[PDB]
């Protein structure tokens, strides 16, 4: 991927409002394993089938 060139003002005075905490998806996956696995496998299968 080609790197993005930020303006000189943004490098010196640039600020971003970002929430950087990462929440685990394990509570959904561990409780519902059959439903979570079937949903993601189906979505992945549709994409790979068109290669």
């Amino acid at each position: 991927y080609r790197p993005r060139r930020f303006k000189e003002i943004e490098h010196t005075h640039g600020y971003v409002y970002r929430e950087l905490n990462q929440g685990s998806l394990l509570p959904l996956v561990d409780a519902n394993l059959k439903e979570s696995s079937s949903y993601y496998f189906k979505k992945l299968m549709s994409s790979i089938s068109n290669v």
Binding site: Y1, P3, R5, F6, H11
Partner: protein, 249 residues
């Protein structure tokens, strides 16, 4: 040149972790350290210019084969960019990093008998500038923590008033102290003033200006790494990370 460019405690310790001891040691014969000599400075004077050579010059000198010479070669590399001539140290010691020698007992080198006052005097601490003294004090603190000589380090600072004011603040075992530290340790860098291709009178000043002018060329060279434009091409192992921790810290 690369060691002189580091401007923060985190960068300096990170460089020392990846740099082996063989970079500190030089394989050029050099000359004996303390001599009154006459050098040629034709830009200023027609007559020869007296000066005294020293171990913190940028040119390699001959060094003692003892452990004292090895530590004195490490510090001269950090503060001047070049080390001294101590051959036949051995493969086992030379392959270790500079930080491992200064901080780890597993290297097999014993340094608890070292005297900080004698080492400082042999390195001509009086001739050092503020950044050079701060860098040497970092080396002393790492050695003191390795040998359990923290009390001796503090007393040596109490005897030397100017050294206490500029002493860097970090615990050699905690990484949180290194990240917080904001001391500027750069010796070479991009100059805000006018830098010209002119000679300097003394050996130390002339050799320092060579690194300063070389760093400018290195900065615009293809060997320099531009984080802003080529961050994705860097390998993940050596890519810059906010949560960068030295091993064991």
């Amino acid at each position: 040149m690369d060691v002189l460019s580091k401007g923060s405690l985190k960068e300096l310790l990170a460089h020392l972790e990846k740099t082996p001891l063989e970079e500190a040691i030089s394989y050029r014969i050099g000359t004996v350290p303390y001599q009154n000599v006459l050098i040629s400075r034709n830009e200023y004077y027609n007559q020869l210019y007296p000066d005294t050579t020293s171990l913190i010059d940028g040119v390699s000198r001959e060094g003692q084969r003892n452990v004292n010479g090895l530590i004195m070669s490490i510090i001269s590399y950090v503060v001047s960019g070049s080390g001294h001539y101590i051959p036949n140290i051995g493969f086992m010691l030379l392959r270790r990093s500079i930080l491992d020698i200064l901080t780890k007992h597993d290297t097999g080198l014993v340094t608890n008998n070292l005297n900080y006052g004698i080492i400082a005097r042999n390195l001509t601490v009086s001739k050092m500038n503020c950044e050079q003294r701060k860098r040497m004090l970092i080396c002393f603190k790492l050695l003191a923590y390795k040998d359990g000589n923290q009390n001796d380090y503090e007393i040596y600072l109490n005897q030397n008033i100017p050294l206490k004011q500029i002493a860097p603040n970090f615990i050699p075992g905690d990484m949180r102290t290194v990240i917080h530290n904001q001391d500027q340790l750069a010796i070479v860098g991009i100059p805000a003033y006018r830098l010209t291709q002119s000679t300097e009178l003394s050996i130390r000043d002339d050799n320092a200006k060579s690194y300063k002018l070389g760093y400018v060329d290195w900065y615009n060279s293809n060997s320099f790494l531009r984080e802003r434009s080529e961050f994705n091409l860097i390998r993940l192992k050596d890519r810059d990370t906010k949560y960068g921790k030295l091993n064991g810290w």
